[model samples]
Target: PTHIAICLYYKLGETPLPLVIETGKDAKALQIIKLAELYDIPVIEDIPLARSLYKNIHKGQYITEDFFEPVAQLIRIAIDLDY
Candidate 1:
């Protein structure tokens, strides 16, 4: 891949949004991953998924149907791991 696509999600009031959406060789992706590790946030690495996400989403946006399933699976696994 020629770019790094990264997204971070969290709740705001009753809404959920991505904290960041970055594509290309940006430092934000690595920094986010590092911060996630430091804070025990689950990290899911799937290049195809990352590319799909970057193509379809942006910072502060909600993920749509096209990308929801895999993202949901990641969340489920994260919950299981945390519990």
Candidate 2:
């Protein structure tokens, strides 16, 4: 299995940007999830988003305009949850 992790950076008056992308497979994937849990980050399961991001985005790069909507949805969830 493959896992993709994205970190979003937010600041007032600036658009939220993805700060990093980490993709891992098999044991590494599991380790990524474990670290997330350790840090108390919320885990969202979106296979297609993961797949698309893993394919299109590179580490430390901001996502394109086409991704804003979907990524915003996830951000909304995080905001709602106070994560």
Candidate 3:
């Protein structure tokens, strides 16, 4: 993890989470699914997030509802975002 983090820090910055993720895992997961429908952060489906609200309720589809909203929003936002 440190190796990846160090390289990313050099390539990105001290806070590389946004960069490494905004263009990789987070970006991949974002475009691969509809997890970005609610926040600046791409995917909120971490085990913690899921467990916080789902916790054996409906097997995980609970968050799926609010998920698409921000996902659709992010899609539009990305298009509108500038370099």
Candidate 4:
């Protein structure tokens, strides 16, 4: 089965690289999640949301405004996790 993985990286006060990956190969998504485990990056598993958002977004671009709330909630979880 195909799956999607997205990486939102913000480090050293730089603008984030909102990288999105969609593939049938599980290794690709696994690799990202594996790395996320090592890097303190957050992983969100909401298939319906991922499938819905990826379709509406283009590579190298951030998700659109329609998803502002959902995405913001994810970020908040990550943020709230630490202290």
Candidate 5:
């Protein structure tokens, strides 16, 4: 199976934007996850969201209106977690 990963760039007063999209059937996905962990970034595994974003948005692009809610929720969860 293919594995996909996305990283988002978010700031306090701006919309969350996609930073990068990494995917492969091999170690590329693991590399993304490992790098995120090394940096203490929160990783949320939402297959539908990842698939949709991977298909619809490109790197450094802002998510569309329809994605705001779900993306916002993920951001909220990340923010709420103690780091």
Candidate 6:
């Protein structure tokens, strides 16, 4: 559900902020996390869904309790945004 590339695309050309790559407990993902953070992108992932990489995942609950707060804030920010 959380794709860092797409997320970065969404904020393209905007101010750098935090980003969480929910890799679902993949310790090795830290390397990529560090790369993202190196450019000032913060990650909020406790684990990465690495299992899906080798197979097909039919379903995913994209949004969960842990993501509610941040996603809601993003919605608010978007709504209050004016051109």
In the range 1-83, model 4's lDDT, one tens digit per residue, is 28666665434445453334432226776787787789876677888777776567555566667777777777778776755
Task: Give per-residue CA lDDT, model 5, range 1-83, as digits (tens).
Answer: 38878777777656445344444334777788898889888999999988888787777677788788998898889987765
Q: Root-mean-square deviation of each candidate, in angstroms?
A: 3.1, 2.6, 14.9, 3.5, 2.7, 9.8
Q: Native-vs-model 6 lDDT?
A: 0.39
What tens-digit string does per-residue lDDT give for candidate 3 at 1-83? 10111001112355322112222234443353443444333332334433333232232122245444543454455555643
Number of colliding residue pairs in each model: 0, 0, 5, 0, 0, 9
Clashing pairs in 1: none
Instruction: Show model 5 residue runs off by greater than 4 Å.
Output: 13-26
Q: Using lDDT, rank the candidates from best to worst.
A: 5, 2, 1, 4, 6, 3
What are the lDDT scores of the predictions, listed in order? 0.66, 0.70, 0.31, 0.63, 0.75, 0.39
Worst lDDT 10-window in candidate 1: 17-26
State TM-scores per candidate: 0.72, 0.76, 0.24, 0.70, 0.80, 0.30
TM-score of 5: 0.80
Q: Encode model 1's per-residue lDDT on 1-83: one tens digit a residue.
A: 45464655646575563334444445766776777789987777788888777766776567787767787787677767865
Clashing pairs in 2: none
Number of the top-ranking candidate, with lDDT as the measure? 5
* Deviating ranges (above 4 Å) for candidate 2: 13-16
Cα RMSD for predicted model 6 = 9.8
Per-residue lDDT of 26-55 in model 2, one digit per residue for the tens? 687688789988987777888888777767
What's the C-alpha lDDT at position 33 in model 2? Answer: 85
Error of 2 at 5 (Å): 3.8
Write down the worst ten-residue block by lDDT for model 5. Answer: 17-26
Error of 2 at 69 (Å): 0.3
lDDT minimum window of 10 residues, candidate 4: 16-25
lDDT tens string, model 6, 11-64? 435423323323332443545566766865533332232333212221232444
Model 3, runs deviating above 4 Å:
1-63
Alpha-carbon error at 29 in model 4, in Å? 0.9
